[PDB]
Amino acid sequence: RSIGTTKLRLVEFSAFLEQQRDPDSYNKHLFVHIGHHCPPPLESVDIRQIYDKFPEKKGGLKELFGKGPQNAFFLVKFWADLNCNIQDAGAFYGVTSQYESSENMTVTCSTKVCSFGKQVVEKVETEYARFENGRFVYRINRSPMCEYMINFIHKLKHLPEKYMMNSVLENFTILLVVTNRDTQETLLCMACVFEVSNSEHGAQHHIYRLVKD
Amino acid sequence: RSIGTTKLRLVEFSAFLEQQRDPDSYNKHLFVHIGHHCPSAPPLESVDIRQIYDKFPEKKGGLKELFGKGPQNAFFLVKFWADLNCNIQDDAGAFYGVTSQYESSENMTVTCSTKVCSFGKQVVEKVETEYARFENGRFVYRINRSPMCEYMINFIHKLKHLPEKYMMNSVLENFTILLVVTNRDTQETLLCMACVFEVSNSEHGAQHHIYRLVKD
Amino acid sequence: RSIGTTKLRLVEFSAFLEQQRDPDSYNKHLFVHIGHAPPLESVDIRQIYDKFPEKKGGLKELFGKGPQNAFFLVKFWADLNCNIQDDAGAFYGVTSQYESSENMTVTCSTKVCSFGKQVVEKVETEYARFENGRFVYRINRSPMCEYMINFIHKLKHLPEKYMMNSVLENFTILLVVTNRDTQETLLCMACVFEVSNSEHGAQHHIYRLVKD
Amino acid sequence: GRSIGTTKLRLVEFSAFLEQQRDPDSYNKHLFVHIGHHCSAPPLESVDIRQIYDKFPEKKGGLKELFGKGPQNAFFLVKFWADLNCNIQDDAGAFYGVTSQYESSENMTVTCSTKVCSFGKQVVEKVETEYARFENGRFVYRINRSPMCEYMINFIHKLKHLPEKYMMNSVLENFTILLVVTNRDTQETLLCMACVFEVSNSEHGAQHHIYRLVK
Ligand SMILES: *CCC(=O)N1CCc2ccc(Oc3ccc(C(F)(F)F)c(F)c3)cc2C1
Ligand SMILES: *CCC(=O)N1CCc2ccc(Oc3ccc(C(F)(F)F)c(F)c3)cc2C1
Ligand SMILES: *CCC(=O)N1CCc2ccc(Oc3ccc(C(F)(F)F)c(F)c3)cc2C1
Ligand SMILES: *CCC(=O)N1CCc2ccc(Oc3ccc(C(F)(F)F)c(F)c3)cc2C1
């Protein structure tokens, strides 16, 4: 009941704000987080429902899902924790991700930020395996957020009501595609949709399998 | 110059409070900090060790006995101005810790003795043994995230309960810590740091002043 | 399954030898390792009571207080295929990592036992760090005691593996992880040892400890 | 003693290495080259930059243009004696990497440009942007385990196939690396290292010699 195949598993996804107010003061706030698999079957969602929320030209979600394998494709619903004081104090907006496999491969992680189903920015990162605790580990550590995403978070936090933030987020999505660079095989695909958390616990997520009917 | 000989050099001393308010919220506050930095600077100022003998434990294993055995160039006075500007969230997922790092050209087994003293009498001692790790062309001795004893956690709580820094400084006049790093095999004193404390009133946060201890 | 409960789970256990031959050369050899399928096999705890101490705070007393689902037998096949070139820049160490949903002060007791009698105890207190959505307890590089370093040397001096296995019949390690505040047993690992003859190196088999 | 640094940025670590995992119980790490953290003392020995212009790319964005813009105190020649005494095992989960660390009193976005040059012509460029971490009372810029490009992995293999170090040294006469660390916001050159290579005369050691570049 996690984001993974037999070939690759998501261990960590963390989007955060670090703030160093002074030499004695450090703070780290998590906006969204997914942790490592821990021992019912995963709920399914028809991919046709999200076709308009992602690009559908050459290399689009429909084309990618068509090539398969279908068991690599997940819908991730995020509730973002925006309860943080953005000070004046060096700020760093970052994303940390970790994957694990039994196999050693060169993996390419494609991150596409999408507004009304149109690509606004793509970030491409290549990662090589590291043998830790009896498995091959792939870590993108402290990937800096683009100015688009920093500005977007600022604009959302300016809205006085969470229903207004959720309304804006209806047209905001992120597509994460992890590919074996050598074979061009899709290892993992995460279609990400966003709301703001109202919970005291903070950031939440719900994972679904993507299928056709 | 720095807290260091040809045999051992202090790289880092950091006393801190970590607080995890919730799964999305982490904070780390430094109370005191020393780092080693490449000098641009004069030799370290001297203090007569006779002036501080009453502020530390004496008789067998005491500062006078340790300084007598030498070497004298291993002995330093450290004046700390502690940053107490932090919100203790009722110790909700709180960790009080000390990180220290030393470096040497030699591979040694080092023993770090910490004696907390009230009016010149030992109130608690902590002893830690460290083994070298060869990192970046030097032997490194790292105590990572050593937990503070309950005496020190309670003491910090009591100080922060005082409404004025002048009241905290009055209490701290009679509070000292003696740090002794020893070669466990030869029993040679590598470094000795006699530590005295005030609270910082600076905007920048924690401050420190290092002196050599001499006899004259 | 794995070594864990709802309250605490073993993530990593490694016993190793590091050697720094020169400034450009570093080597690390693992003797034994555990990293986190049908349900785990059961073993009757009565079979192993004589292999561990049974006075006040002993295995029978600990198992009696429970919970029983915290108690495991770990059979290790140790990889002794390593050139102890010298103790020349050599470090013998143990790394362990545990995870829990709860924030606790955990006490890790390690008892080395010869013919069911304690020869050395190491007690290590660990405080949580919240990493990747869980509380993590890491003993990062715990130095081996001289007893264990000398024991490994003496075993490797024997010309045949059957002789090493014979000596190891009367050697055990008891690992007890306790909530320091409540004194609840979180995990107990009763460890028994053979030498590996496998090309793959170190192996292990985990069992639940039960009464019948 | 000798240190690659200015008042604005100082090299703490440069390490090029090979990690090998022979089996689940066996790990090895070999350093090819290493520069450590180092601190009155006299000036560094000088080299006329005109002598090395042919050994690095020139015209627009070139070493002459970079040195012209300055500051001159940011420019260093680094002679490396590489340790190639290592057993490259057959497909044994190998990782070829470079680890670098810089420190500053100032908080900056720094861009590290690495240009591998054969006969003074760029064969590969790697660009890495690093953001500061405030650690032990300073801003630290760490590129941890940057993977070596196939060109460099293949080059190390081909050199090690030669039966004599003097033959490797002959090949290395036309091999250089240019490291340029830039303040991304202001486009100021913080540090420039013009790197030349020999194989070490030692059985098991790596060495280096640092020089100032002058006109
Ligand atoms: C340039 C691309 C980039 O900076 N990204 C894309 C990857 C990524 C994924 C998740 C997050 O985290 C958030 C945080 C807050 C919200 C908000 F505003 F509440 F909806 C998010 F949608 C996503 C950042 C990035 C950064
Ligand atoms: C059991 C010993 C222990 O926990 N120690 C001794 C070593 C040590 C050194 C320094 C600090 O940091 C502080 C922080 C604040 C004050 C205060 F409050 F100003 F007095 C200090 F005196 C010392 C902690 C320890 C912890
Ligand atoms: C002082 C205690 C100590 O040093 N320990 C106890 C914990 C521990 C657990 C496992 C190992 O690893 C080995 C390695 C080899 C053998 C051998 F030789 F096969 F018997 C073992 F039994 C255990 C070391 C320690 C170290
Ligand atoms: C794609 C660029 C790359 O992978 N690089 C360039 C940066 C770098 C710097 C130094 C080293 O280390 C060596 C090791 C050995 C030799 C040799 F062959 F002996 F001369 C070197 F020249 C350089 C690697 C890189 C990797």
Residue numbers in the entry:
A (entry chain DDD): 209 to 247, 252 to 300, 302 to 426
B (entry chain BBB): 209 to 248, 251 to 426
C (entry chain AAA): 209 to 244, 251 to 426
D (entry chain CCC): 208 to 246, 250 to 425
Q: Which statements did the authors publish about this structure?
A:
To improve the translational potential of our studies, we developed two TEAD inhibitors, 1-(7-(4-(trifluoromethyl)phenoxy)-3,4-dihydroisoquinolin-2(1H)-yl)prop-2-en-1-one (OPN-9643) and 1-(7-(3-fluoro-4-(trifluoromethyl)phenoxy)-3,4-dihydroisoquinolin-2(1H)-yl)prop-2-en-1-one (OPN-9652). OPN-9643 and OPN-9652 inhibited TEAD reporter activity with IC50 values of 5 nM and 15 nM, respectively. To further examine OPN-9643 and OPN-9652 binding to TEAD proteins, we performed a protein thermal shift analysis and confirmed the binding of both compounds to depalmitoylated TEAD1 and TEAD4 proteins. In contrast, when OPN-9643 and OPN-9652 were incubated with palmitoylated TEAD4, we did not detect binding in thermal shift assays. Our data suggest that the compound binding site is occupied when TEAD proteins are palmitoylated. Co-crystal structure of TEAD1 and OPN-9652 in 2.03 Å resolution revealed that the electrophilic acrylamide group of OPN-9652 reacts with Cys359 present in the entrance pocket of TEAD1 to form a covalent bond. The natural ligand palmitic acid reacts with the same cysteine to form a thioester bond. The fluoro-trifluromethyl phenyl ether and aromatic section of the tetrahydroisoquinolin occupied the lipophilic pocket of TEAD1 where the hydrocarbon part of the palmitoyl group binds. The fluoro-trifluoromethyl group occupied the palmitoyl binding pocket in two different conformations aligning the fluoro group deep inside the pocket or on the opposite side. Together, our data suggest that OPN-9643 and OPN-9652 target the palmitoylation pocket of TEAD proteins and inhibit multiple TEAD paralogs.
